[PDB]
């Protein structure tokens, strides 16, 4: 379902971080395994009604032109926690303030290790920074994986 000109971005040196960790239990919910590639480690957490916010966030080594993004069930429990909707903001290089995404990116429910793809329109040039708050559902959520993509020469 992914669109064909999409490239995802390499990972291995971003700066990731979230709201909150489930249980605290950072080796086993923390923000990291939702970009290590593998389905069944997964970022987990608190949704906005519990914690009062909910969001991960990765500082991009080298900034891309966003294009969309995709995320994955998450893997620590039930299906009823995979994520629902959510909002976005990103940061440009150079820049100290913040651009909302003005849209709601709303998913359907996940088959099986399978992403959902949400994309930006236009492509946001020089992101260096990317937040994802999560809105719904809103007492527990996460994911496994979550990637950026840019578009291929
Ligand atoms: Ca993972």
């Known amino acids: 379902?992914?669109?064909?000109?999409?490239?995802?971005?390499?990972?291995?040196?971003?700066?990731?971080?979230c709201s909150n960790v489930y249980a605290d239990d950072d080796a086993?919910?923390?923000?990291?395994?939702?970009?290590?590639?593998?389905?069944?480690?997964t970022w987990?957490?608190?949704?906005?009604?519990?914690?009062?916010?909910?969001?991960?966030?990765?500082?991009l080594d080298r900034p891309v032109t966003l294009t969309g993004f995709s995320v994955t069930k998450q893997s620590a429990?039930?299906?009823?926690?995979?994520l629902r909707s959510a909002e976005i903001k990103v940061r440009k290089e150079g820049e100290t303030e913040w651009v909302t995404y003005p849209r709601v990116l709303?998913?359907?429910?996940?088959?099986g290790a399978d992403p959902q793809?949400?994309?930006?329109?236009?492509?946001?040039?020089?992101?260096?920074?990317?937040?994802?708050?999560?809105?719904?559902p809103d007492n527990y959520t996460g994911f496994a994986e979550i990637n950026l993509y840019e578009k291929q020469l």
Not at 1 to 17: E, F, Y
Not at 44 to 59: K, Y
Not at 106 to 111: C, H, I, Y
Not at 122 to 136: A, D, G, Y
């Open 1 to 17: 379902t992914k669109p064909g000109n999409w490239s995802a971005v390499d990972r291995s040196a971003w700066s990731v971080s």
């Open 28 to 41: 086993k919910y923390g923000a990291h395994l939702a970009i290590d590639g593998e389905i069944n480690t």
């Open 44 to 59: 987990f957490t608190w949704g906005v009604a519990n914690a009062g916010e909910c969001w991960w966030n990765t500082v």
């Open 77 to 82: 429990y039930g299906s009823g926690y995979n």
């Open 106 to 111: 709303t998913f359907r429910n996940f088959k």
């Open 117 to 136: 793809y949400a994309a930006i329109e236009p492509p946001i040039p020089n992101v260096k920074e990317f937040r994802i708050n999560c809105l719904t």
